[PDB]
Structures are given as structure tokens and as C-alpha cells.
């Protein structure tokens, strides 16, 4: 079971989708009108939304969820992820067998979300469609993890212990630098 999820290579899909989002934002905001750049720089609002393509779907096991903050935890093998979901409608669409916890699910589609906050940019991952397939009551002890709800601090954490995490953190930092260079 662990091998099946490890063969998914979620990092490849994440890197490709991040590159696509960065390129699309770069080409779509080449106007470089100074007053427009100033006025879209506002606190706590989304600026762009890039939906992932059909090729990059993966499956993970739900370990925990939080309805008040719409925070959902995913894991596979060594790595566990903390992401957000659109709303309760995503949960209702996924015909959960008994409970969201300890259920194997497949992500039909998700979208990268970019936000400006505290004079910097944070990238959020939002799950849009969910589908449960079978219940897996097997606790996977993930030594390593990355957080999408804390930004660069939540991603660069524990980077030294995983080469893939290091590369993804470097890509994230480069994307942040390019975004801030273009907008400001």
C-alpha cells in the first residue's frame, strides 16, 4: 500500500503545476501598469487562481480534518501534507463510507491560490473535488512533512532531511521572488 502511494510521485505534479501557474501569471500580467499594480496590492485577498490540469491527480489517505478552519491533512508513505478545501460541499460530494478519517481518496482536481499578506506573498492549495474509494485504517508515521497553510516558513521546514522537499522549497522561494519582483 505504501509502495502504491510512493509510486505516485506527487512532487513531480506539484512542481509542474507550480511552474505552469508561475508562467501563466507572468504572461497574463505583463501590462506592468504602475497604478494597477499598486491597487491590486491589498491585504488579505486572492489575486490569481490556477486550476490543475487533468493529468495531475493523486491519491492519499486522510489522517485528520478541521471544519472550523477548513484544514485537511493528507499523507502517503513518508510525507504528509496539510492543505485546505473549498467548503463543506467538497466533503458532501465525496461519498464517504463511514468518516473522512482513515479513508483513501482520490483528488479529482485542485487549484493553487496566491495571496498577499504581511508585505509578502503566500501560496495556498485548495482541494476542489474529492472522491472516496476504500477505508484504510492503517496509521502511517510520516517523519517528514510540508505545510501549505504557513507559506515559506511552513514549506522550508524540515527541508534538510529530504532532497525532494529541498528542491520544492527552492522552487517555491524562486516563485515568491519572481512574484514580488514583478508586482513590486
Amino acid at each position: 500500500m505504501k509502495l502504491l502511494l510512493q509510486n505516485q510521485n506527487i512532487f513531480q505534479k506539484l512542481k509542474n503545476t507550480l511552474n505552469g501557474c508561475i508562467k501563466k501569471f507572468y504572461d497574463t500580467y505583463q501590462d506592468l501598469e504602475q497604478m494597477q499594480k499598486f491597487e491590486m496590492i491589498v491585504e488579505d485577498k486572492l489575486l490569481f487562481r490556477y486550476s490543475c490540469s487533468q493529468s495531475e491527480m493523486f491519491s492519499a489517505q486522510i489522517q485528520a480534518h478541521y471544519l472550523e478552519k477548513r484544514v485537511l491533512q493528507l499523507t502517503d508513505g513518508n510525507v504528509k501534507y496539510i492543505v485546505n478545501f473549498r467548503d463543506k460541499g467538497v466533503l458532501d460530494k465525496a461519498n464517504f463510507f463511514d468518516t473522512p478519517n482513515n479513508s483513501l481518496v482520490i483528488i479529482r482536481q485542485w487549484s493553487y491560490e496566491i495571496y498577499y499578506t504581511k508585505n509578502t506573498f503566500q501560496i495556498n492549495l485548495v482541494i476542489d473535488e474529492m472522491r472516496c474509494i476504500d477505508i484504510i485504517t492503517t496509521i502511517f508515521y510520516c517523519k517528514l512533512e510540508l505545510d501549505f497553510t504557513q507559506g515559506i516558513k511552513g514549506i522550508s521546514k524540515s527541508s534538510s532531511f529530504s532532497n525532494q522537499i529541498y528542491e520544492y522549497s527552492a522552487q517555491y522561494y524562486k516563485a515568491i521572488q519572481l512574484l514580488k519582483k514583478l508586482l513590486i
Binding site: 463510507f97 474509494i133 476504500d134 484504510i136 485504517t137
Partner: protein
């Protein structure tokens, strides 16, 4: 005389097996057990599922599952809880459909492998079936019967009961075998004709 036919029915085929004594669809079994009545109304999809579902058992157990007036049928547990109770009751037996991809630890059951058939088990049709049946009778129906549900024009998927593959299973001397296959495809060549230097013919001296 007996002729082969291009069209056949699963129930008709099953009735030709001597080992199985009771073969019927779910709807008629429920009517015989009086769990439901003809005057009662159900959804068309649920009725079709009941009609198409085929069950069988090695013995006639209609009386055992006869409706009891001692206590009515109301459900408060989850379908997963009922299935777990049935699996725990199964105990050490290790050839049943419902145990595929799962293991039992004491009074706790653990799922660790992917089973595509669990969707039918946990479907709303089976939920309504459990609502009609009751926990104590469902836990034993999942064991005493072989459950087959139609999912195609002619295909059926077994979801409960003993696995069908179990039905497809003082010594005497056996002489050795001549190793004739060793002759073929030998590309080795030696300076002096004879046999290989590794043979006991050449090893002695």
C-alpha cells in the same frame, strides 16, 4: 435431448447444483421471511436491486430467519459497525469474501488493502437492506448466505459468503524421471571427445 443455449440465467444454473439446497433471489427470500409485504411500497431502484440480487445457502434456513414479534426492527449502529461485528463473529475462518483486504485483531478489525467490492457493501442499497433486516439477523445473513449482485447485462459480483474458489480444489511410490531435456542446446566443445571434465568418469583419476 439436452442442448446448449446462448441465453442462461444465474438462478437456473445455480438450481442445478446439488450442494446448494436453497437458491432464490433476495426479494422472494424477504417475502418468505415476512420481513416485508407486497402491500408495502419501496423505491423502484431498491426493488430492482432486491429482484436482481441472488442469494444461496447450503441448507434451508427460512425458519431460522422468520420474523419475530418479540422485538421490532430499528437501526442505530453504522453499516461499518455491523460489518465489523460480522467479521469479528467470523473469527478464525479465513475464506470469506468480506475478509478480503482486512485483518482481525481481537475485537478490532483493520483495513489495510484496497478492495473494489467494498463500494457495493457500503452502498445505500445495502444500508436500506440493513435497515429492513436488523443488526442481529444481518450479521448472520452475511455469513450463512452467498450474495451475488448483478452489475452488468450478465455479470455478477459476489460480495459475501464463502469464496467460490474453495469449491475448485497413505502414499504410493513414484518412480524417478528421465532427464531427457538436458540433451538439447549444448554449445560446449572440448579438445578430446568423451564427457565433461566435471563428470565422475573423469574426476576419479
Amino acid at each position: 435431448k439436452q442442448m446448449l443455449t446462448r441465453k442462461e440465467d444465474l438462478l437456473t444454473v445455480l438450481k442445478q447444483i446439488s450442494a446448494l439446497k436453497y437458491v432464490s433471489n433476495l426479494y422472494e427470500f424477504l417475502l418468505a421471511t415476512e420481513k416485508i409485504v407486497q402491500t408495502s411500497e419501496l423505491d423502484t431502484q431498491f426493488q430492482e436491486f432486491l429482484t436482481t440480487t441472488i442469494i444461496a445457502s447450503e441448507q434451508n434456513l427460512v425458519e431460522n430467519y422468520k420474523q419475530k414479534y418479540n422485538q421490532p426492527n430499528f437501526s442505530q449502529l453504522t453499516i461499518k459497525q455491523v460489518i465489523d461485528d460480522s467479521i469479528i463473529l467470523l473469527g478464525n475462518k479465513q475464506n470469506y469474501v468480506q475478509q478480503i483486504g482486512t485483518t482481525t485483531i481481537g475485537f478490532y478489525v483493520e483495513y489495510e488493502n484496497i478492495n473494489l467490492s467494498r463500494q457495493t457493501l457500503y452502498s445505500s442499497n445495502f444500508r436500506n437492506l440493513l435497515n429492513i433486516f436488523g443488526e442481529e439477523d444481518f450479521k448472520y445473513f452475511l455469513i450463512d448466505f452467498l450474495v451475488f449482485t448483478k452489475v452488468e447485462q450478465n455479470g455478477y459480483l459476489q460480495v459475501a459468503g464463502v469464496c467460490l474458489n474453495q469449491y475448485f480444489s497413505e502414499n504410493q511410490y513414484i518412480y524417478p524421471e528421465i532427464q531427457r531435456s538436458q540433451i538439447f542446446y549444448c554449445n560446449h566443445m572440448g579438445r578430446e571427445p568423451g564427457v565433461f571434465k566435471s563428470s565422475f568418469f573423469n574426476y576419479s583419476e
